[PDB]
Assembly symmetry: C3
């Protein structure tokens, strides 16, 4: 009789990369790079705040347009490119740091405080910042002006006797004329100094016309102070002070901000990009280097195929290290669809085929053990650094860019090497399981059969279907057939 | 006779991770993550300076409390959380950069210089800074005041004609009243400008009361200049100048600073953390991301087990690639305690067991070669970046945090992959050595024995203890027994 | 007859590192670290601009010495250590950021603009900046002075109505005396404020003598503004303004700057270091961490040898996992120079040797597949961060240094692990190909030969040269000789 060992093959193989070859065909493979988004930022499970027409800073200051954002919290604040300011013209020195610390804090929770502004006119107001069809101002800021043509020197204190840090936002007004300076504050100069036990911020206003923003040549420069428990805010002003009305609560947590024009969708996804939410089943992604949540790692490769099956073809230069698959076994069997390894036989009762379940399962379990290491195990990242920039800044920006490029190149290397190593090992382990099955079958047959060199055994006795079945299921008694087999082997 | 090949096993195995399995038991394993400190910073072999009640900046300025730190050097300066300043109230713009450059320099070596302060009163003194029960000041700073109610415009020069850089520390006094400004300096304003060939630092004092620190509403702002050889320091002051008394030597080397409340111990250890000194035998550590010296690399894993022995069990899905261990050899032998591989026999004279030394050693040497790559080869790091922060700063701090998080995640990946790869290879190499021993034994026996399929050979002749011994030690002559063996094999 | 399987060896082996051994000899190996430069910066294929005696900033401002650099472009600007400024003394706040953004832009393209300087004297000039033997000034800057002893308040505007960004360079003059201030500008103070819609830069000059640079105690402080399309530059000055004569075009691209004293050579090389251009065939380099172009990655190792051949020696502790090379095959054959694996025979007609081409090629193809992954696949880097520093700066510099050290250590790890893994696999794959050839030969011979245990087969029949040739080329019919062979094997 004849008993042949073999493995399965498929008509639709997949090309993968290995350590020793750029292009080898395997029976099956899975993609490890996520390359697509559905185009929507899912509203679950992270608390999304669409900024819509407002930036985070405008919502913080209290632009009238952003009145509905009062005391809001978020996991992720989404800034739109269409956003525009429509209150008094302002600048923030170190705007990026203020935007970052508020975004990381994740709250616009504001508590009003009763400051003693004796001797000055409160609630100053402008036609550049109209609220409910009336001239107004930033909701969190108090513009102070002269009362009875006098602005006395202010020396106003507020202690932090709480158990949490207080974030104070205040500003300095720069009029476009000496005339407006006199009209507003009486005083010719003006000067603002705010202090804590640990800090001093001293600002001297600059009178002068700047290019008009929405017809306004004057500006407000915005500053912030953090006052910890047991510390005290102290505000000296001889004019030009845009006063705080209280403090923001500042928290620490997982909160962040992202620039994106993707719509908010009614859906659930853990990983957010500016292109929209992405699946996180895969370990790597090519969609965006800017991410929030439990996200695949950004890599530069567009595709990385992990082999999830054996080799599909013979090829000498990538043949497994044991030399069975693509080796002494000439080809796989497309007609074996119930297992990865198996037996074909020819006897007196005909020709048959049967899969080996134990070797098939042993190969599958090893491949699944690789998949369990790589699939569905992404790591959470929240507030990070900015990675896209609208203006030239030089040295700090060069550093932020370099850090991200360095990180991406290292992760792109890790991903490439991982796939090449795993694929080489997957091809070698599947070759190994075939070789083990052949060796086990050979030992079983003892002196009753000879290797024909092609994965087939010439069995030197009469072996019916039950006899072939006994070999396949490990119950073959060689002693039963040994005399018949030895006579047939050793003759003339 | 019967001769069986086998391997050792133990009752107390250890679970490790591989490429293809999350949980596999091996005979032995070693821990690669250091997770503990003894709680003391060892005083050897690095030169430790305990700052005790003083910060590095207070010791630099010459707070009276820190007079014993004059001209000290260190490899590592240790700042305590209990530390407090008890001289005149001061701030430093870019305090972190000054603290860093002094810490990296590693010396408080100070050389006095004779500045020409003609026309002003020297050695100004305060009740806020008492030394030996007398009102005093910072030991390295010279407070200048009016003489005869006049403060002439100063224009004082000092050349660097040395061969080393000079670090000058100076300050600006901000009085809390215009009255104190007049009393001290005569002049209503005051102004300080210090220059080199390459730099200018122009400071305008700010008169005004700040929140009181130890009853003092006024402040001194501290600045520094570095003057290189062939350059010149030039100091213009029309008042408010806190003058230097000389320069600090500035060096480059391995020096650093660390925040820690761990006691200094009388001991010797190369790696220092804020939690105390740690062993550096292991390649990785989980104790602290802040380190100094020849230290294991910080990783996020709490444990990483490297297999140092073979597989302890049979398991089909992780059976070695050669298929002997956990394969056709059903189980290991707990009663073999003199070697990792060996022989068991049954003959006419009884049953015995003996270890194979050459295969045992070949496996051990390979595992030791892995250990030699990983154990006791840590790399020295000294002055780095700060990694814990007491205040919100925004953009720069976001970057410093991101750089460290990026580095830790990459090293944590390297450590995880290394263990999984090495463990897979260790299991495969130990399976290989077993297979090689079996194959070598098979070839030795020629036609005188048959494989029974379980790692045992049925020897078809009479083989006494000396005959079994000859097989084990490679002196078996097959030709001697061939006729006897062939007759027994090939019969009816 | 006797047929022996074997492999080649060489007299001049090369030591490599593996996973399990520090020192193993292989037949051949290639170097993966580039350690040398030819000492010249090649002028091709990147556009080189030698700055010679000029810095990039001096060429930008228009030092007379740098007049030949007007409107130049470059891929790489080369600054020399011999470079020196010979116009009016200047400083740049954030000099490093300005130098960086211009270097990255890669162009000195300048367009003159007609500013309305009504009421002031234009084209101010100095003996500190002589051009063609006449007193002059920076070519891109316009020094404004009083006209008729009056300096009216300037309020000068320039819109960007183009489609590209404009880079404006301007300055502030600080006279060394109040007298020179009056002589030049009439006004006692002077003040400069330049604004856009988005920015304000307000500079107050500081009257005062600094240490003389080439006999000059006064200074010009340089500032820059970028004005985007639809934005407007606005310049207010009441004195001391060093005016722009137009704008620089600003671009984005692959341009950079490098400090180097290496000569420019007439040659072609893609990778530039400060030490000179380097070959980029190798994946790693030890020459410099500062690079430009398609460059090998900087690593700390001086040498890394990748094995490109099999093991050259027997050694038990690193013997391949199949146990043929350095195993049951006692040694290689130095006399086999036509292939890596082969046959030696002894028969009735003599003794011979012949190489196996198919196994030799299979090993070579796998090794070449590794080489194709590592050789000639370097990645392009252009403008990065600075990595060498001439002055102490503290925190930002600590961060830039830490980022680079972190990156180098990670790449140095990747390179070390790659070589150790590849070399282990190369030794194992070459052992595998030897084992496959032996196993294939064994199956071919069937019952006509016996393994002697040393890679040699005892063939139990008369096998002439044509019979040996038939075995080597896969046409051996075992059935022809089986009766003769069985009689000789199984006798007394």
């Amino acid at each position: 009789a004849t008993l042949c060992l073999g493995h399965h093959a498929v008509p639709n193989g997949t090309i993968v990369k290995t350590i020793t070859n750029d292009r080898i065909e395997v029976t099956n493979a899975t993609e490890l790079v996520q390359n697509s988004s559905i185009g929507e930022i899912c509203d679950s499970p992270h608390q999304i705040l669409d900024g819509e027409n407002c930036t985070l800073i405008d919502a913080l200051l209290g632009d009238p347009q952003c009145d509905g954002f009062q005391n809001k919290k978020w996991d992720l604040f989404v800034e739109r490119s269409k956003a525009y300011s429509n209150c008094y013209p302002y600048d923030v020195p170190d705007y990026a740091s203020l935007r970052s610390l508020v975004a990381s804090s994740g709250t616009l929770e504001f508590k009003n405080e009763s400051f003693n502004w004796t001797g000055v006119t409160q609630n100053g107001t402008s036609s550049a910042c109209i609220r409910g069809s009336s001239s107004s101002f930033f909701s969190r800021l108090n513009w102070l002006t002269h009362l009875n043509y006098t602005y006395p020197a202010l020396n106003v204190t507020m202690p932090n006797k709480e158990q949490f840090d207080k974030l104070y936002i205040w500003g300095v007004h720069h009029p476009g004329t000496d005339k407006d300076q006199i009209f507003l504050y009486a005083q010719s100069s003006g000067r603002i100094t705010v202090s804590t036990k640990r800090s001093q911020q001293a600002v001297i206003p600059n009178i002068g016309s700047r290019p008009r923003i929405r017809d306004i040549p004057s500006r407000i420069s915005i500053y912030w102070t953090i006052v910890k428990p047991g510390d005290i805010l102290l505000i000296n002003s001889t004019g030009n002070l845009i006063a705080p009305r209280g403090y923001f609560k500042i928290r620490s947590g997982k909160s962040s901000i992202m620039r994106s024009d993707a719509p908010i969708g009614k859906c659930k996804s853990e990983c957010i990009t500016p292109n929209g939410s992405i699946p996180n089943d895969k370990p790597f992604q090519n969609v965006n280097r800017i991410t929030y949540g439990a996200c695949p790692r950004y890599v530069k490769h567009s595709t990385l195929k992990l082999a999830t099956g054996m080799r599909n073809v013979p090829e000498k230069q990538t043949r497994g290290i044991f030399g069975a698959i693509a080796g002494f076994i000439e080809n796989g069997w497309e007609g074996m669809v119930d297992g990865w390894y198996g037996f074909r036989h020819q006897n007196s009762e005909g020709r048959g085929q049967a899969a080996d379940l134990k070797s098939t399962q042993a190969a599958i379990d090893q491949i699944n053990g690789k998949l369990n290491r790589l699939i569905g195990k992404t790591n959470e990242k929240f507030h990070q650094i900015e990675k896209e920039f609208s203006e030239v800044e030089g040295r700090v920006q060069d550093l932020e860019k370099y850090v991200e490029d360095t990180k991406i190149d290292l992760w792109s290397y890790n991903a490439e090497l991982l796939v090449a190593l795993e694929n080489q090992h997957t091809i070698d382990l599947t070759d190994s399981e075939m070789n083990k099955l052949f060796e086990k079958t050979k030992k079983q047959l003892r002196e009753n059969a000879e290797d024909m060199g092609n994965g087939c055994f010439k069995i030197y006795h009469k072996c019916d279907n039950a006899c072939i079945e006994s070999i396949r299921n490990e119950t073959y008694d060689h002693n039963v057939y040994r005399d018949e087999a030895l006579n047939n082997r050793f003759q003339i």
